Amino acid sequence: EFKAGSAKKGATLFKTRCLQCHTVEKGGPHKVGPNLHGIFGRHSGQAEGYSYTDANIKKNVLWDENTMSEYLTNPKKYIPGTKMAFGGLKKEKDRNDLITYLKKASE
């Protein structure tokens, strides 16, 4: 599903649609949502010091581009009971862009 996109456009999507709840940089603080540094390649629910729902932890998904993509289409469907209040990125090109950005910034 996932196809490489534009990191630049991904940056704008993140600013607009995610930054209110999430920081990305190494050492960034938690907010409404967890800091996302190092999210890719990790199991869900493992950002240190963050208070996750049991739903998020029990999902037991390894985050990669493709699982991220399916998650961001409809977070509540992918992880029933998650407290992440976000409807979804419905456009495939938006998911691709955001993920391209996030893969790089969260490294």
Please give the residue ranges that form the binding site for ligand HEC (CB under 6 A).
17-18, 20-22, 32-34, 39, 44-45, 47, 52-53, 55-56, 72, 82-86, 89, 98
Give least dist CB 5 to ligand HEC, A: 14
**C-alpha closest to that of 47 among 71, 63, 69:** 63
CB distance 33 to 21 below 8 Å: yes
Give least dist CB 46 to ligand HEC, A: 6
| Residue 68 labelled as part of a binding site | no
Query: How many helices and strands (H and E) does the chain possess?
Result: 5, 0
| Residue 30 labelled as part of a binding site | no
Q: φ, ψ for residue 5 (rounded to 5)? A: -130, -150
Annotated binding site for heme c: 18, 21-22, 84
